[PDB]
Every structure is written in structure tokens, then in C-alpha cells.
Amino acid sequence: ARPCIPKSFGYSSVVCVCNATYCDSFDPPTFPALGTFSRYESTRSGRRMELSMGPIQANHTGTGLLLTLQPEQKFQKVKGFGGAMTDAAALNILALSPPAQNLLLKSYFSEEGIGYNIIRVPMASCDFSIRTYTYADTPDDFQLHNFSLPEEDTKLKIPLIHRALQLAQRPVSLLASPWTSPTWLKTNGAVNGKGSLKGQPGDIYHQTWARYFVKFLDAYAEHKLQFWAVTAENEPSAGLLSGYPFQCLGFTPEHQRDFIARDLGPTLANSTHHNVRLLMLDDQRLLLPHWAKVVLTDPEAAKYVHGIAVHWYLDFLAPAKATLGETHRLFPNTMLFASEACVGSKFWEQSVRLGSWDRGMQYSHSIITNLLYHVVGWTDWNLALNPEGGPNWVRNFVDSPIIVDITKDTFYKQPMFYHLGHFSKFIPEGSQRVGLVASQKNDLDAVALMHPDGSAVVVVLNRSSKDVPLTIKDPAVGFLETISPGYSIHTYLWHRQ
Amino acid sequence: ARPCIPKSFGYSSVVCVCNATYCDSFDPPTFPALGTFSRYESTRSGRRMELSMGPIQANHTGTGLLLTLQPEQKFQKVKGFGGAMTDAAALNILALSPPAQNLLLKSYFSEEGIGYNIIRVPMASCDFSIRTYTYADTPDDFQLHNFSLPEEDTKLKIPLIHRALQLAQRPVSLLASPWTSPTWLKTNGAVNGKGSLKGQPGDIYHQTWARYFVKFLDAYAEHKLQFWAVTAENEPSAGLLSGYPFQCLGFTPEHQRDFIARDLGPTLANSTHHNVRLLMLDDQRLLLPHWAKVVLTDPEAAKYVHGIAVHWYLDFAPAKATLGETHRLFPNTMLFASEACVGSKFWEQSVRLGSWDRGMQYSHSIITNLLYHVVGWTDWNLALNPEGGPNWVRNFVDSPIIVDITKDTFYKQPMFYHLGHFSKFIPEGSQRVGLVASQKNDLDAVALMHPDGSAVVVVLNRSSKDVPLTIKDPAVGFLETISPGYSIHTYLWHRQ
């Protein structure tokens, strides 16, 4: 429908420029006829999810790299893909003119964009906020008589969420996560730094905090928003470290276990929101499988836990298999879910690198490794940031797939946006990842899934500089002859009957 | 003989203040009779390797955790402990007046201090230099006729090293590591960034680079200094990273494999320096076991590799899966910690004067290393200024001694004493042995056997609670003690 308007900022690749009247968009999706495949291509050299089609060949010799589909090797089903509606993201989106806001939201949520179906919502303030607040800042208000949603929710977050759901291709799932409790529930009486809930699981500080989840959900329900899930706490390990700079609330895995068992599970289970799922951890995978053991080998906490949530930030010093794989080995019936990722990365590179192809590859690299190790979904951090990677009240600036330039009523779609798009647009909720074996050692990253309609989707990422010729075999159908260009990512689709 | 002069700077504990006429020091060791032990204690509250003594008796009065010496279980033998004489360390030491310099050097190398017996020496410049330079900056000098040592070596590093050896109670070993080759040998023609050697193992570029190691060893040998070992490159993986900010030289594990096999191994071994050890990796431990499998399964490379050098940064990949697994796979190739440092969280503060937490990080990681077969442990810069500098790129990192040029004073941090709890009492040749815990506890502990047969046990308490403790020697009896919250003890006793 409309192509990328490219612009260079002197990094490895370009961004796609959008404004009030223009943004790159897709045509409505069409089924490739049986015996054909669809290919979506993005390249460092400038191609941005271009649609092309080819034949599936009945025969193939000799020769070189072959990746064979295994429809009988069935693994996890997919929950979905999305990002976080933080104070910082919402504030940036709304600072644009209304027509630019819509193109922005369609890019993420529409069928003319990348079909996101998860939105993470912080419960009150985090570091990507411009002030600290919780929903119950009256000291010692154990009854939560003064619990209320501030404007951050009622004027920025919630209206943006509604407009996304309205644009949305697919049913959208909301995920909620707290950074800090009110400061009077905490041993250090501050939103940041080392500190946890006062007293012990089962007591009034613990029961009040559990009740605060219920009040949060009650309040969102009044604005016609239902949650798919909540996490027990964002990065519980963070609140264990002295001088921790921004909002946190410390739990050892034992504390989380008992908090879930005593307070948070029963409270949620006895509320009108009993169907909301609870995910534990919500922190770096380096904490697995230990954290999952402590919590899930206690059946009183296990009965309340639907899933384990993981953060991507390092990560690089904890190989998937030893963390993600082991945990699945031990609790195959507790889903793994990536609830937060950003870049990053690095201490000598700027927070925002407009046009960075490398950062795009890190996303898709991580998404593929995640899928290969059982993870059922993936959630980017901030949906939009400014060219500084903010705002952020502790200046903890990071990058985002969409960068808003408020003076120019313009936004930039980075490579990360598209690299994400290669998964989000084409893997709906209910897809099942399947086997895919390589006939020879290669430099590609690849993953195959089965769409709920029976069709196939395979994503191939090439992080080397060299083109790599390859064929994908599907026994039901034949052979896709293709080439993977250096510094590219392709998604391949085709019907099976 | 002289106690710590404490000073607080607002962090969890104190530094010890030393200057031209005063520094904290030890008396010569003694050999207490069988049935008595010596304890060195440092606490966050202020004690600094304080010596006391007591009895190891036949009756067991304690009721809590029991640690039993098991001398029959024998593990790795120790190579030693030390730190890096970088350009920055040397500049910092040399900005003190002479008598202050001596007290500093004694703190680390002397019997009166902590008994260091390793020095790592960068081969030309790294980030802790105040300028970029190699030993062969003149382009296209493939025979290296113009190879030479600048002032940083001949005026700063080398004199300091000679003096450290004059003072040292023990034989000191030197370990050398390159950050970058001459830039005209690299794919990118720069000192930093994504770039390897040009061409391929075997060719003129590789041959020249390998010869540069020999020229370096010759040059130091003219200064009457011999090396124990060299690493094949500092952080080879760094140079695979686009825009890497400081001096680097990229090798994939295969490239390191082939460079050692074809060039570095043959050249070193066909030189008068054939006894110098070669250590591979010299990088984060997350690269293990993989890097070890690639290099060490090719017999042509393996025959040249004495050991695997690891950095601790960047550790927070577990010990078992890296060090444990690498030892299982290659049990006759020593593991050695070539560079350790802290390591500041982004809300810090590269230098935190008096930080007890950083102390604990050092001793905790030394203990973990000992429990996973590592034979040696090298700190990074011997000394830095209060800004954690000089560093030509950016400072991130603290150091056990902080020099204040303007007051002719230097500060010994908790890191210094945490290292000392080990380096002072574990000489080269010491062997790690069993130490069995009777019940789950929060302590970190390790036992070793001195070459003279005596026991050394280090007990670290990272919790805030006092832990009542009994240590048992099957040969002697029971030692009743308490490990206070936020403390580190070293226990020493004779076994016959």
C-alpha cells in the first residue's frame, strides 16, 4: 500500500519516516495459492518487509543447505507478540498530532501494520515515567481508601490502549506488572533502593499489597479493560540491591513463593478476576531454573502460577538451554514467556541509534532463540521513545522500535520494528512451533511454526555478510528454492493443502 | 607491627590511610605449636587482618555448623596471586614520593604486606594507558627492525617491576598479554574496533605478529626480566564487536586455534623463550567450554597450550557450566583467572572508597574459583587515582589501592584485604583439599594445604548474622570460633 520513506542517520541502515499524512503500510493479507510460497524480505541495504512470491518445486538436487520441516515434532503454542504502554511511550505518542498518532498505532496494531496482540502495562510509575507515584500514596492506608488512577492512566495509557484495541486485527491481551508498592508497605520507605514488603507473607502489609492488585484490576475494569495476566512483580531481584536507582520491590524467591501462596493467589482467586493469570519471576533468565524450583516445588504456590516471565537484558551470560530449556524440562506445563526486552547494549554506543541494523538482528536473534527454547511469546519494552530514548526520570535511556520526533510531528520506524514484524505479523496466537533440521552446519538462525489454519511459517535470519543459498523441504508439499542474502531476515509462508 | 589508620568516605566501611612515613604492615610469620591456631580477621566494622590465636582441642563444645578438613581429597595446586602493572598503575605509584612508593610496593609484595607473586604486564597500550601506541608503529616493518620499548616500559613499568621483585618474599612470575597489534597488521587499520589480523594463519601478517611476541620477550630479557607465561591475546572476542572502544585484536576461537598452531606455538618454541607458557582464551568465562573445545581438540594447537585464562566480569554464566564443565572436558589444562575487577553498576561511582561490598565480591569470587579448579588469580590495575583513572577511553573500574597524588597518600580498600586473606597465606605449590560442611549454611569456605603441610582455611560471611562455627582437623581436634556477620577470616594451623 505504501513503501518505506528511508532516511540515514549515518548508521548501518535507514529508518522509515512517518508523519501526519504518510506511513509505510501493508495491503490486506492474501493466501498464496497451493504450490506457491510468499516471502517477506527486510535487508540492511534498505528493503523493508517487501512481499514476493515463488513456486514450490516437486523435486530438488543436489546439493547444498537443506532445512527440513518436521510437522510431527510439535512444541509450544504461541501466546503472542507486543510492547509496553509505559508513561514514556504514551506521553510521546500523544504529543503527536492526532493523524500521526493513528498511523503510529496502526503500524503496531493494525492488519496494515505488524499485528501486535500483547500490551504490557506498568502498574503505576517505573523509570520510564516522569514522576514517581503509586496508586495509594496516602501513608498507612491499609484499607486502600485513597487508591486511585492518576492521569497517566486515565488520560494517557488507557485511552491509548482503547484505540489500539479498536484498530487491532486480533484479540489483544493485556499484561500488568508493578515496579513498586506504596512506600509505607516497604521496609526502606522509598520507591527505589534495597527494600521489600514489611513483615511476613500472610500479614497486613502482604494482604494489602495483594488487595492493591485487585483494586488495580477493578479500576481498569471500570474503564472497560480486562487483563489477560499479571506478574507477581517486575524484577524482584532488583529490590535486593542497595542503591537500586529506580522503582523496585525486593523479593527473594522464597519470599515470592510465600507471597504467592499466602496472599496474592488466594486474593486473586477469590476476586471477580480469578481468570487473570499469574506469572512469576518477571526477571533475567540467569535466575532460572533456581527461582522456578523454589516456587513451583511448593504446591501451595504452584496451584496459582500459570507461567514464568523472563527479561532479555543479560541473558547473554546464561545460555538458553541451561535456563529456559532446564526450566521447561522440570515444569513442562508452566509456560515460559518473554515479558521484557530492550537494547541494551552498549556502554560506548548511544541510547538511540537511528537506523541500527545490528539492533534489529539482536531482536530477531533473541526471538528465534526464545522460540527454539519453548518460550510462548515476546514483549518489547517501550512502544515509542524520543531521540534521547526518554523521557526517563533517572536518565536510564534505552532504544525503542519507534522513535518520536515531536518538533517535526514525525516518527521513525527502526530496523527492530521490522525484525519484530517478521514474527508478530505472521505468527498468530495458537500457532505451534514445529521441528526444523538442517542438513549441514550453517550460519543462519531459523524457526518453523504451524499457523492454526494448518499453514506454514518459517523465519530465516542471516547475521553474516554472505548470501547463503538454501532449500526448505516440506514433505506434504515439496521444496522452496531460495537464497538468504547477507544481513537479511525473511519470513516464508505457504499453504499445505 | 603497624595497624590500619581508618578513614571513612561515606561507604559501608573504611580505607586504611598510608603516606610517606606510615603504612599498615605485618610482623614475620610464626609457627605456633600443634594444638594452636592463628586467625586473621577483617570485619566491615573496621578490623583489618587482625591476628589472634587460640586452641584446637580434643573436645567439641560447639553445636552449630561444622566444617571438617578432609586432607585426603586433593584438588588443584596453586600458581599464585597478583595484579596488573598497567601504564595507569605505574603512573599512579610513581606520582607518590619514593618512601611512599616503597610502602605501597611492600603492601603487595613483601612479607610485611600480602605476598603477591604474580604480575600481569600489558604488551604495549590498553585502555589504562594515557595514549595509543604499539611497539612497532612504523608501517610495513614485517621483520620488525623498528620494534622498541617506549618510556612506559623503560621508565615506568620495568623499574617498578624490578623493585617489586627486590621486595618480594616469594619468587614472582610475570604474565604478558597483548591488547592490539600494530594497526598495519589489522583488517581495519585501527587500534580499536572490529578488526583481526590480515590474511590467514601461516602468512606474513601472522608470522610478523607471532614474532612480535618474541621481540617483546627479547626486549624484556635485555632488562633482565623473564616471563612465566603469555596469553594469546587479551579478550579476543572483543575485537569481533563493531565499534569496540579500546585496544583490541579480534580472533574467533578457530582463528585463535590456527594462529596458535601455525604461528604463535612454532615461533615461541623455536626461540630461546621456549619455556614460557602459552595461555589461551584470556576472556570472559561464558566463552567456555566452547572456546576450549575448538582450540584444544586440534592436537596441533593443543600441544602448545599450557592453560586457559579467564576474566571475571561478566560472571553473574554460572561457575559449574563454565569452569566445572571445562575441567571435566580438559582435566590436564589449568584454569587461571588472568583479570578480575569491579565492575560498577550504572548508578555507581567507579571508585567507592571503603566499599565493603566490593571486598566481598573479590573474596567470594576467589572462593568460587578455588572450588572450581582455578590455580591462580590476577587482579587488574595495581593502583588507580580516585576517579578510577587514568584511562584514555572511560573509567568503570575500582582498584585495591587508590592513590591521592595531591596529599602524597594512598588508600588500601577492603578489596585489598579480601585478596590478602588468600594471597598472603596461599603460596605457589599449595594444594586445595576437601572441607566438608555438616549442614546447609550461608558461609563461603575453602581449605588448602601449604607446601609445608599446614592448613589454611578461609571463611567468608556475606550475611549480617554471626555464625557460630566449629572447624575440625581429623589429625588435631576441634577449633571453636564464630564467623561474625560481614567478615572474612583466615585460619592457619600446624597438623603435626
Ligand SMILES: *[C@@H]1O[C@H](CO)[C@@H](O)[C@H](O)[C@H]1NC(C)=O
Ligand atoms: C510527509 O511525508 C512525505 C514524505 O513521504 C512528504 O511528501 C510530505 O510532505 C510529508 N509531510 C510533512 C508535513 O512534512
Ligand SMILES: *[C@@H]1O[C@H](CO)[C@@H](O)[C@H](O)[C@H]1NC(C)=O
Ligand atoms: C602519615 O600518617 C601518620 C599516621 O596517620 C601521621 O601521624 C602523619 O601525620 C602522616 N603524615 C602527613 C604528612 O600527614
Ligand SMILES: O[C@H]1[C@H](O)[C@@H](O)CNC[C@@H]1O
Ligand atoms: O524498568 C526496566 C528498564 O527501564 C529497562 O531498560 C531494562 N531493565 C529492567 C527494568 O524492568
Ligand SMILES: O[C@H]1[C@H](O)[C@@H](O)CNC[C@@H]1O
Ligand atoms: O582492558 C580491560 C578493562 O580495562 C577491564 O576493565 C575490564 N575487562 C576488559 C579489558 O580486557
